[PDB]
Every structure is written in structure tokens, then in C-alpha cells.
């Protein structure tokens, strides 16, 4: 570092996405059948208002490689002010309905991974003069392990029904079928993905960036969520 240059911290915030639903209908031949505002209830659970979309990306810029980390924060835990019995469990209001979950419906959602640490290496190329192409890969980690280790012995009181046969005498290789044989039960799935885009700066301080957020290529396109929230991004670097 013979010269200070302009190497150092920068802050990024992605946004864009577009949609067009029956948000604003154009009734006329069916006569007015809507209320003043039509309060949403059974028709819609809620959506919007809760959990907007912070997702903040910050890092350090070095002519070449760039380190970036994404934080979501919020694990359904309400720490609130250090106090006990802050909220009253009993309420005078008759209305309640804590869970609207319906049977024989099993609505789709997200529960595999919520609020987790994200780290990815993206590369800024000083190859060009005014715009550098961005390319890298994602490595996603989250809280899944608490204790350092269980026990040295792996013997369990419960007998594993997956593979009881062993052919003590005669008869061997009776079961040639593949067996997954799952050990520890951990829903928390690890995640990998890729990040790419191109930035056109007025100066490193103001740059227009086309950003794309995609998942890792696995067994066919079975990925649930797509871009989710990506297309255009603005990032500031002194």
C-alpha cells in the first residue's frame, strides 16, 4: 500500500422488481359491488406492512477482490425492553385467532432457513475504465449447531430398523438397494448460490448496477424462490 488511493468501505442497497395484480380493478358493467375500503380478513392473511425488506450489503473494495456480507436480522424472538410480564396474556377483547392455519390446505411458505449469516466473495475488475463486471459465489451459514460435539460412542439404545440384517451365517449382499441412512436430524439446510452484475460509475461514489441474485445449479430447476428481489442496485464508494 505505497499509496492510500481510494481503497476502503462502501455501502450497497439492491432494489427494483415489478408486478401488476388486481390491485386496481376497472369495474363498470358489473355495477359497484365493493365497500368503502373493504377490510381484508379471511381473503388475505395480511402480507405487506410486516417485514419489509432491509437486506443490507456492506464491505471493503480492493482493486480486484471484494468482501461482502449480508445481514437479515430478526429470529422471531422479541427481546423487548429488559422487563418481565411486559405484556398481559389475558385480554378483554373477544377477537383473537392466533393461528389462521387451515387443514387440508397446507399452504406453502418458508421454514427451511430464517434469518442467517451470508458471506460471498464478489470481484470488482479494474480491467475497464468506467465500468467493472462483477462475478463471484455465495456461501450461506446459519445457527445449526450448539454443542461442540455429542459423545465418542455412536451406539444408540434404540435399534436402527434401516439395516437390521447382516447375514451372520450364509446369505450375504441380500440388500443391494441404496440406503440413505440418515443420522442426525437437522432441518437447517446449508445454502450456496451465485452473484453477478455490472456497474457504471460517475465516479466510484455513484454507480448504476444491474444486479442478479440466483441460486446454485442443482438437480434440474427445482428451486422455489427465483430472483426474489434483484435487478437494479445502487452502491456508493467515495
Curated annotation (Swiss-Prot):
Cell location: Cell outer membrane
Keyword Ligase attributed: no
Cysteines paired by S-S bonds: none
Keywords: Cell outer membrane, Membrane, Signal, Transmembrane, Transmembrane beta strand
GO molecular function: porin activity
Entry keyword Flavoprotein: no
Role summary: Implicated in a number of adherence functions. OPA proteins are implicated in pathogenesis and are subject to phase variation.
NCBIfam families registered for this protein in UniProt: autotrans_barl
Protein name: Opacity protein opA60
Organism: Neisseria gonorrhoeae
Lineage per the UniProt record: Bacteria, Pseudomonadati, Pseudomonadota, Betaproteobacteria, Neisseriales
